[PDB]
Amino acid sequence: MKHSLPDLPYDYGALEPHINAQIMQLHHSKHHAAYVNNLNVTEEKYQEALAKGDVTAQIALQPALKFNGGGHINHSIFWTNLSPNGGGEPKGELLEAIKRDFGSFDKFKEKLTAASVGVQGSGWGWLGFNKERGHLQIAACPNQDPLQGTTGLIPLLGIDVWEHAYYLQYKNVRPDYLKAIWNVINWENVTERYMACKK
Amino acid sequence: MKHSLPDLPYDYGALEPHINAQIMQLHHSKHHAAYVNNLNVTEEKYQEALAKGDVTAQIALQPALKFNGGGHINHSIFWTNLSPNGGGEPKGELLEAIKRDFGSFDKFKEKLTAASVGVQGSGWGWLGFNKERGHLQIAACPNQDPLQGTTGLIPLLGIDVWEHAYYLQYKNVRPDYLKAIWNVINWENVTERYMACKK
Amino acid sequence: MKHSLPDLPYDYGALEPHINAQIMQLHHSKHHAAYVNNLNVTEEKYQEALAKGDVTAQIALQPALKFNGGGHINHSIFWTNLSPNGGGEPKGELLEAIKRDFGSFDKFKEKLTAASVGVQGSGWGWLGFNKERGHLQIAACPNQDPLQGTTGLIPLLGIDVWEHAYYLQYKNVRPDYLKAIWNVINWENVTERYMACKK
Amino acid sequence: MKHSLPDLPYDYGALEPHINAQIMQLHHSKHHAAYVNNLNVTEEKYQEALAKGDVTAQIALQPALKFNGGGHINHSIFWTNLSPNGGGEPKGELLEAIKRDFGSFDKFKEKLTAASVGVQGSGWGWLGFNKERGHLQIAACPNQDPLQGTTGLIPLLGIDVWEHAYYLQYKNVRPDYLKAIWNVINWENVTERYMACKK
Ligand SMILES: [K+]
Ligand SMILES: [K+]
Ligand SMILES: [Mn+2]
Ligand SMILES: [Mn+2]
Ligand SMILES: [Mn+2]
Ligand SMILES: [Mn+2]
């Protein structure tokens, strides 16, 4: 049942100037930490409700489990999606897949940027893999709703557009934040997630 | 642990002419039976996912668990809500609480009818008890979303307004079904549920 | 401006034995008629609220407009989707697109059936066209939420899985209804809708 | 159709130290301004769709109209709910109503604080008036969903718990922000809104 806050693979200040160290420290050691804590509490509460066949309690716990469970899933992926050695564009089959499904890398960037700017309220923009169709797909998710659990798409790259992800540095200007984050995307990790489901 | 289809406390034809035996037989014997079976299937797979700490699988199973778990809870209460000896008005504290919160016995029926006719698509109308506030409350819920699990209200009386609850007999005229259902309301059961959560 | 109940292009009994005349008569003559009337009522009140800039009233009217407006759109398409001369397979580009996107003509039916059986509560299964992507796509929509208005997909073929669409004839066994409906699909209409949005 | 950004009845720095001037300036001249701009665009788009009977377009515009329309409604109320002359507790009938419905002012504060901390993602906590029942009621709303348009309750006091409402000053600690805002509540305005619907 027991989930843990993952260590960051880099320094809190490693993504500067694109994402400042203070955001990274708050985002990791507080926001994600809170999701992990509450997930462990909720999962424990669910094991009792399940053991006693309390269907009402199982249903009552669903919002907290999706919110905190999704929060843990989403941020865990997010940290691996970023790197001080990031930026540029991918290559190999992923770049080939991107231009097949979206026309171009720059059209892909436009589509995902538009998806992420367009989130009303809190949420996430995702590049996902539709293993059914065998093609890439852009999706947006509200709040902490995780990509795979709610849509079946396999997450490759996630963009957090909760205001806490950018407000201290970029205030309200979400397009400025989205422009900066392209510089820190860990395309090697994105490629690994893509190749992992192409046996 | 394992859930069971409750037996009906009366014959399938006991509520005629208000709800005919054919509806009662398919409603209990087919619809509810499916919910119980699928709930038991869903619960087992959730215990596997919880044991492995698979949050994605837990979140993916949430719609099936709420639908079939809620379906089981809602219909379980519904059968006890009805009686061939039903109809008329409640007595004691229940009726007095109804006149306190709704003005009159007959104003409550209008509101509970209005809530249930107003359901767009499939759902339920509920008379519930707000334990925090200590008064009665009308609510509608979509599909099989159970009252207590999603709103915290204690269910006292439920009206099924899924089309399968009336279509064979009343076709599209949902108000005709709601007029007939008052004749079979088991007010003794409603009062018992009300008295149960009053200290 | 003012919406109208479309006439059926065939007799109420023209789709027997697959869907009997009694369902067709209540579905067109009662259910759809109600949606059109309530849409026209709702539209007028919205024009009043817009004229006064009453945002609260506009937002309060949104559920009734989507339900009745969607109800009108969905059933309007549905009647043209069916024909006594229907059944079999499509021809030309439509069938080739189906085999491109779904593998085979028969794999598509499985998926479209699976999407429509899977609807929890009332709703619709849709074969749609993704103009942006230029490929076919399967989607399900709840209640009367219309395909294009809520997802952007162009509707080609809709399967009504509201219980009133089948319950009188097929009772609870929704798969029996879905097996019968393939015999009356008007593939010429489906192809026309597909060809309409292809430059 | 034409909505306008209301002038603030006070200086951007008038609520310091409880809400700093920079948050107030960003909140009013950017976040609310954006909602007003997009509301006017959406309403204009809706008048064309309504004039032509384009039901699909009307439904497609509903998310933007509720989001930006609600954003305008919510923030307009919010500004009047705050005052440099605010704080303390209400008196007259409102205080009498609060202790009748919630037991105490301090229990009322606890309930609304808990409702506002509990919002998952972006949203609002509200003290509302149920004119039907004639009693006060606490409600939470997601994103910019406005109270009256979505629940029928009349708004009296709104607490914005979007992260942009507090993050620059209190970072993630929403309980600290909620503690501070009690010092700036304009109870005179809250009382006026309550008395306005008690003829
Ligand atoms: K009976
Ligand atoms: K027919
Ligand atoms: Mn985040
Ligand atoms: Mn039922
Ligand atoms: Mn229908
Ligand atoms: Mn705000």
Numbering used by the authors:
A (entry chain B), B (entry chain A), C (entry chain A), D (entry chain B): 0 to 198
Question: What sentences appear in the manuscript?
Answer:
Human manganese superoxide dismutase (MnSOD) is a CPET-based oxidoreductase found in the mitochondrial matrix that reduces ROS levels by eliminating O2•− with the unpaired electrons of the active site metal. Trivalent Mn oxidizes O2•− to O2 (k1 = 1.5 nM−1 s−1)8 and the resulting divalent Mn reduces another O2•− molecule to H2O2 (k2 = 1.1 nM−1 s−1). The second sphere of MnSOD harbors five residues (His30, Tyr34, Gln143, Glu162, and Tyr166) and information about their protonation states would be of significant value in deciphering a catalytic mechanism.
An SSHB of 1.5 Å is seen between the Oε1 of Gln143 and Dε1 of Trp123 in the reduced state. Serendipitously, one of the active sites of the Mn2+SOD neutron structure has density for an unexpected sixth-coordinate –OD ligand (designated OL for anionic oxygen ligand), and the Mn–Oδ2(Asp159) bond is stretched from 1.95 to 2.44 Å. Tyr166 and His30 share a LBHB and His30 is Nδ1 protonated, like the reduced resting state, while Tyr34 is ionized like the oxidized resting state.
